[PDB]
Amino acid sequence: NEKILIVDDQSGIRILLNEVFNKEGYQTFQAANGLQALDIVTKERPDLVLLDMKIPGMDGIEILKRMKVIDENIRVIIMTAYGELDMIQESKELGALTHFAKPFDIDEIRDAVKKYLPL
Template sequence: MKKKILIVDDQPGICMLLTDILTNEGYHVETAKTGKEGLDKVTSSSFQLLMIDYKLPIYNAFEVIRLMNQTGVSTRTIVMSGITEEVIRENEDCSNVESVLTKPFNIQEVCDLVKSIIG
């Protein structure tokens, strides 16, 4: 059975790129455009990994993670951002954040990181 990854990003190009890369690596990928949509999907279905952009409409990444944790969902998470310093500061409270991925990212780095987290 394929491992499921949820990608939450309001930039369609990022979602398409990551979907193509990770589908080719053998994962089942779903996407969401807003923090709210991502939260709804991650709390209603089982994912092995959440890849979420820091700045999103409605809820940012850490609001989604806090709300996930309140509902008992502890999906392993990669936060993606072009402003990593701010993200790393806010990340200190979130134990299920495995990594902060700096945009723009290297495709091989993404593949290696996902494999290291969920196999």
């Protein structure tokens, strides 16, 4: 029943993550930019978002703020590129659950969402 939206500009990684959580029984969706994402959040209203903050043109902080407006029950976990202080701080402020840096420990990501979005 749980839905997870994976936002990432890179097919390879995005597709790998998707599988990790499909394999877990989660209804997963995928987005490559903040526009698509915003769209899916609107349409599907996922429980959690795995949001890549490094997307060209993309202001991840802004999309994070919008998701919430759209759906205030959505929880987000941001993916940093080797964690950046100010983004991590604004996100905590925005309500993000945690942050994971890439390259990631898939197992740790896994463990993390299961804990945050128990099936």
